[PDB]
Write a protein that holds these residues in place. Structure first.
Motif, PDB file in Angstrom:
ATOM      1  N   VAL B   2       0.861  -1.134   0.000  1.00 20.82           N
ATOM      2  CA  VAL B   2       0.000   0.000   0.000  1.00 20.82           C
ATOM      3  C   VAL B   2       0.924   1.217   0.000  1.00 20.82           C
ATOM      4  CG1 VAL B   2      -1.701   1.299   1.436  1.00 20.82           C
ATOM      5  CG2 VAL B   2      -1.640  -1.265   1.409  1.00 20.82           C
ATOM      6  N   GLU B   5       4.711   2.210  -5.331  1.00 22.76           N
ATOM      7  CA  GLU B   5       4.647   2.769  -6.653  1.00 22.76           C
ATOM      8  C   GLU B   5       5.067   1.636  -7.532  1.00 22.76           C
ATOM      9  OE1 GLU B   5       7.798   5.690  -6.703  1.00 22.76           O
ATOM     10  OE2 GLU B   5       9.357   4.263  -6.274  1.00 22.76           O
ATOM     11  N   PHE B  56       6.580  -8.654 -14.633  1.00 20.85           N
ATOM     12  CA  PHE B  56       6.323  -7.341 -14.151  1.00 20.85           C
ATOM     13  C   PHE B  56       4.807  -7.186 -14.036  1.00 20.85           C
ATOM     14  CE2 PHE B  56       5.015  -3.013 -15.466  1.00 20.85           C
ATOM     15  CZ  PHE B  56       5.296  -2.378 -14.261  1.00 20.85           C
ATOM     16  N   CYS B 121      15.222   0.785   3.099  1.00 20.38           N
ATOM     17  CA  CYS B 121      15.299  -0.427   2.302  1.00 20.38           C
ATOM     18  C   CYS B 121      14.100  -0.372   1.416  1.00 20.38           C
ATOM     19  CB  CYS B 121      15.275  -1.651   3.215  1.00 20.38           C
ATOM     20  SG  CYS B 121      16.810  -1.533   4.200  1.00 20.38           S
ATOM     21  N   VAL B 122      13.886  -1.472   0.707  1.00 18.03           N
ATOM     22  CA  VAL B 122      12.883  -1.538  -0.335  1.00 18.03           C
ATOM     23  C   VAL B 122      12.231  -2.862  -0.222  1.00 18.03           C
ATOM     24  CG1 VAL B 122      12.378  -1.590  -2.870  1.00 18.03           C
ATOM     25  CG2 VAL B 122      14.107   0.058  -1.880  1.00 18.03           C
ATOM     26  N   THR B 123      10.922  -2.848  -0.354  1.00 16.92           N
ATOM     27  CA  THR B 123      10.195  -4.093  -0.465  1.00 16.92           C
ATOM     28  C   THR B 123       9.414  -4.056  -1.731  1.00 16.92           C
ATOM     29  OG1 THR B 123       8.894  -5.716   0.717  1.00 16.92           O
ATOM     30  CG2 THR B 123       8.189  -3.345   0.910  1.00 16.92           C
TER      31      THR B 123
ATOM     32  N   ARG E   5       0.832  -4.916 -11.747  1.00 19.61           N
ATOM     33  CA  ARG E   5       2.197  -4.510 -11.970  1.00 19.61           C
ATOM     34  C   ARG E   5       2.953  -4.457 -10.661  1.00 19.61           C
ATOM     35  NH1 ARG E   5       0.382   0.549 -15.941  1.00 19.61           N
ATOM     36  NH2 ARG E   5      -0.163  -0.639 -17.825  1.00 19.61           N
ATOM     37  N   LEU E   6       4.148  -5.030 -10.704  1.00 22.56           N
ATOM     38  CA  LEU E   6       5.023  -5.151  -9.562  1.00 22.56           C
ATOM     39  C   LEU E   6       5.165  -3.798  -8.899  1.00 22.56           C
ATOM     40  CD1 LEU E   6       6.875  -6.957  -7.786  1.00 22.56           C
ATOM     41  CD2 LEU E   6       8.741  -6.251  -9.412  1.00 22.56           C
ATOM     42  N   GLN E   7       4.978  -3.786  -7.588  1.00 22.77           N
ATOM     43  CA  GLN E   7       5.105  -2.528  -6.887  1.00 22.77           C
ATOM     44  C   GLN E   7       6.332  -2.562  -6.024  1.00 22.77           C
ATOM     45  OE1 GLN E   7       2.289  -0.191  -6.882  1.00 22.77           O
ATOM     46  NE2 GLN E   7       1.907  -1.440  -8.751  1.00 22.77           N
ATOM     47  N   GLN E   8       6.722  -1.387  -5.566  1.00 21.67           N
ATOM     48  CA  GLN E   8       7.849  -1.257  -4.689  1.00 21.67           C
ATOM     49  C   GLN E   8       7.574  -0.151  -3.725  1.00 21.67           C
ATOM     50  OE1 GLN E   8      10.714  -0.054  -7.643  1.00 21.67           O
ATOM     51  NE2 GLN E   8      10.119   2.151  -7.516  1.00 21.67           N
ATOM     52  N   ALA E   9       8.289  -0.153  -2.595  1.00 21.39           N
ATOM     53  CA  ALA E   9       8.206   0.958  -1.677  1.00 21.39           C
ATOM     54  C   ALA E   9       9.532   0.963  -0.954  1.00 21.39           C
ATOM     55  CB  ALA E   9       7.058   0.715  -0.682  1.00 21.39           C
ATOM     56  N   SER E  10      10.021   2.160  -0.640  1.00 21.81           N
ATOM     57  CA  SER E  10      11.110   2.376   0.181  1.00 21.81           C
ATOM     58  C   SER E  10      10.514   2.481   1.528  1.00 21.81           C
ATOM     59  CB  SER E  10      11.654   3.781  -0.138  1.00 21.81           C
ATOM     60  OG  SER E  10      12.384   3.617  -1.324  1.00 21.81           O
ATOM     61  N   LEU E  11      11.240   2.017   2.526  1.00 17.07           N
ATOM     62  CA  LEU E  11      10.697   2.057   3.899  1.00 17.07           C
ATOM     63  C   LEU E  11      11.886   1.832   4.809  1.00 17.07           C
ATOM     64  CD1 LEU E  11       8.752  -1.386   4.407  1.00 17.07           C
ATOM     65  CD2 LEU E  11      10.633  -0.898   2.758  1.00 17.07           C
ATOM     66  N   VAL E  39       3.889   3.497   4.070  1.00 17.71           N
ATOM     67  CA  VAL E  39       3.734   2.399   3.129  1.00 17.71           C
ATOM     68  C   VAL E  39       3.595   1.161   3.986  1.00 17.71           C
ATOM     69  CG1 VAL E  39       5.198   3.446   1.300  1.00 17.71           C
ATOM     70  CG2 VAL E  39       6.287   1.708   2.947  1.00 17.71           C
ATOM     71  N   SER E  40       3.108   0.104   3.336  1.00 19.94           N
ATOM     72  CA  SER E  40       2.964  -1.159   4.008  1.00 19.94           C
ATOM     73  C   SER E  40       2.974  -2.257   2.972  1.00 19.94           C
ATOM     74  CB  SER E  40       1.642  -1.271   4.764  1.00 19.94           C
ATOM     75  OG  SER E  40       1.619  -2.544   5.468  1.00 19.94           O
ATOM     76  N   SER E  41       3.671  -3.302   3.317  1.00 25.06           N
ATOM     77  CA  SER E  41       3.497  -4.571   2.659  1.00 25.06           C
ATOM     78  C   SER E  41       2.058  -4.960   2.925  1.00 25.06           C
ATOM     79  CB  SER E  41       4.425  -5.578   3.232  1.00 25.06           C
ATOM     80  OG  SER E  41       5.768  -5.373   2.772  1.00 25.06           O
ATOM     81  N   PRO E  49      10.726  -9.934  -1.031  1.00 29.82           N
ATOM     82  CA  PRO E  49      11.969  -9.413  -0.472  1.00 29.82           C
ATOM     83  C   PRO E  49      11.762  -8.082   0.237  1.00 29.82           C
ATOM     84  CG  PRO E  49      11.720  -8.789  -2.804  1.00 29.82           C
ATOM     85  CD  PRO E  49      10.601  -9.719  -2.499  1.00 29.82           C
ATOM     86  N   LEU E  50      12.543  -7.925   1.254  1.00 29.11           N
ATOM     87  CA  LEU E  50      12.871  -6.651   1.831  1.00 29.11           C
ATOM     88  C   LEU E  50      14.391  -6.582   1.630  1.00 29.11           C
ATOM     89  CD1 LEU E  50      12.297  -4.043   3.496  1.00 29.11           C
ATOM     90  CD2 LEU E  50      13.003  -5.388   5.479  1.00 29.11           C
TER      91      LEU E  50
END
Ligand SMILES: [Ca+2]
Lengths: 61, 131, 11, 223, 96
Positions: B2, B5, B56, B121-123, E5-11, E39-41, E49-50
């Motif tokens: 959530v 991007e 993707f 970090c990035v998930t 579509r594959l998402q990502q977030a910095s956290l 953001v949240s998984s 992955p993290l």
């Protein structure tokens, strides 16, 4: 108490007891759960961490 | 994720999708080399499931993806399904992933590695974007 | 490992 | 504070109320003579009220002390709220005990995800108005700068951060301004502004105190 | 909302002490928290992955594991702490 249900209730043997439901449910916790955590999977394994001095009624007969 | 991007396509090449035999995604994973994916133990991966690498856009049927059969699931025996501790499973692939621009391995840390609190970090993943 | 061919771009 | 809880009397002993015949902002006691608040709370004739819980009832632990000096950050921009910090010097030293205590300033900027305590006597309603008598508290995380900027594009300076809940429902609100955001025992934030209170996608925005520690030292040392 | 579509977030990684502020005793040594940052998984992210940079290279620091039942972006996501598990990973790879 008799509203949501818990199959697997564990209580300390104190008076009053400190009880929790350790049921895992998919995607949400029971209706009375104040503190719910879930795995981020599909389905989400959800666990209610609430401690109460009772067990909810069993889900199963 | 959530409030994440959309990733640059292929830019997290180790990210795999764990799918059931129909292509339904239920968890992610990460390739740690050609033959192994690391995923969460609680995902309940079985050898009926498939590791899809290189995706993707799961809505697209036109990506060079690899649907990889799982030979063997290695759930960490310390995994506690109630506390979700030790929440790791290795998937040995029946056939090696073919590494390419969009498919390759994430690095594994040493057990002694310090990833300090506060580190950005990035998930990644195809989890819900809105609950 | 760990170095994508296609560099991630993060906001 | 919307969606918070009653702190408990004097459990936030650095929280002060800034009073000009009514509670109009909070603040944070940072030593016996000085309170940090928001520069937009600046006014003549501030009375600092320490040891308050119920701000509408004299309960016996209050210290009311007039501001002798109310020093707004010299680069305070009232239009963007950049550098929204002010130091208030008390006309007399506050008596520091369990119920009135200073809060430490940061020694470093807190990282996003750190849980903070935001407190004040501001509005407890996200729509409409209900001012509490007793001090309300909210645990809220610091949001990452990217989330904050995403929420408030063009408005988030390097001197600001967001804290709260993007889902809404919990936030600081009018009457909380100037008051503390305390994270791991350091004053990281000052209640500054937001789009409404507790609205989805509109977390509170807080003055980033860690950017001001030298200025605070200097101002204290100079006054 | 699930994404094609594959998402990502910095956290941010949280200290286990900070994370415990949210999750209390649920947080075990083989867990590492990240997020509570807007953001949240979320469901379907599990097992993924993290990753953090380690000398230019993305390194698996966490595995998406669990957290807020509502994926609240103000609660830390909890990830399997790969440093705590990587010995087991290596031993399993070695034996297999
Ligand atoms: Ca009072």
């Amino acid at each position: 108490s008799s509203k949501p249900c818990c199959d697997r209730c564990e209580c300390t043997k104190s008076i009053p007891p400190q009880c929790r439901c350790s049921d895992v449910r998919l995607n949400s916790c029971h209706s009375a759960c104040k503190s719910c955590a879930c795995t981020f999977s599909i389905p989400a394994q959800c666990f209610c961490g609430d401690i109460n001095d009772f067990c909810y009624k069993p889900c199963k007969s | 994720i959530v409030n994440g991007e959309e990733a640059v396509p292929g830019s997290w090449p180790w990210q795999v999708s764990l799918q059931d035999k129909t292509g339904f995604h239920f968890c992610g994973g990460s390739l740690i080399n050609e033959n192994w994916v690391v995923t969460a133990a609680h995902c309940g991966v079985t050898t009926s499931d498939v590791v899809v690498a290189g995706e993707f856009d799961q809505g697209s049927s036109s990506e060079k993806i690899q649907k990889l059969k799982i030979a063997k699931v290695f759930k960490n025996s310390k995994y506690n399904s109630l506390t979700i501790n030790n929440d790791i499973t290795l998937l040995k692939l029946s056939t090696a992933a073919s590494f390419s621009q969009t498919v390759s391995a994430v690095c594994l840390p040493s057990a002694s590695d310090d990833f300090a609190a506060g580190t950005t970090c990035v998930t990644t993943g195809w989890g819900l974007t809105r609950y | 490992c760990g170095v994508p061919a296609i560099q991630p771009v993060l906001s | 504070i919307v969606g918070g809880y009653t702190c408990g009397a004097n459990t936030v002993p650095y929280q002060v109320s800034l009073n000009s015949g009514y509670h109009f902002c909070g603040g944070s006691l940072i030593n016996s003579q000085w309170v940090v608040s928001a520069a937009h709370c600046y006014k003549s004739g501030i009375q600092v009220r320490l040891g308050e819980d119920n701000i509408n009832v004299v309960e016996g632990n209050e210290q009311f002390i007039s501001a002798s000096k109310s020093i707004v950050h010299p680069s305070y921009n009232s239009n963007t709220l950049n550098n929204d910090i002010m130091l208030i010097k008390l006309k007399s030293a506050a008596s520091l005990n369990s119920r009135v205590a200073s809060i430490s300033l940061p020694t470093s900027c807190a990282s996003a995800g750190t849980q903070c305590l935001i407190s004040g006597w501001g509005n407890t309603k996200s729509s409409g108005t209900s001012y509490p008598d007793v001090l309300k508290c909210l645990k809220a995380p610091i949001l990452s700068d990217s989330s904050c900027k995403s929420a408030y594009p063009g408005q988030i300076t390097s001197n600001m951060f967001c804290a709260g809940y993007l889902e809404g429902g919990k936030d600081s609100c009018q009457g909380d301004s100037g008051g503390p955001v305390v994270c791991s025992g350091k004053l990281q934030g000052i209640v500054s502004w937001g789009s409404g209170c507790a609205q989805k996608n509109k977390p509170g925005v807080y003055t980033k105190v860690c950017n001001y520690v030298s200025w605070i030292k200097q101002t204290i040392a100079s006054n | 909302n699930t994404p094609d579509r594959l998402q990502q977030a910095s956290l941010p990684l949280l200290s286990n002490t900070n994370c415990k502020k949210y999750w209390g005793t649920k947080i075990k040594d083989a867990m590492i928290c990240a997020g509570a940052s807007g953001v949240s998984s979320c469901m379907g992210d599990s097992g993924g992955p993290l990753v953090c940079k380690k000398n230019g290279a993305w390194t698996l620091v966490g595995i998406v594991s669990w957290g807020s039942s509502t994926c609240s972006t103000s609660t830390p996501g909890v990830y399997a702490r790969v440093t705590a598990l990587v010995n087991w990973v290596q031993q399993t790879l070695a034996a297999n």
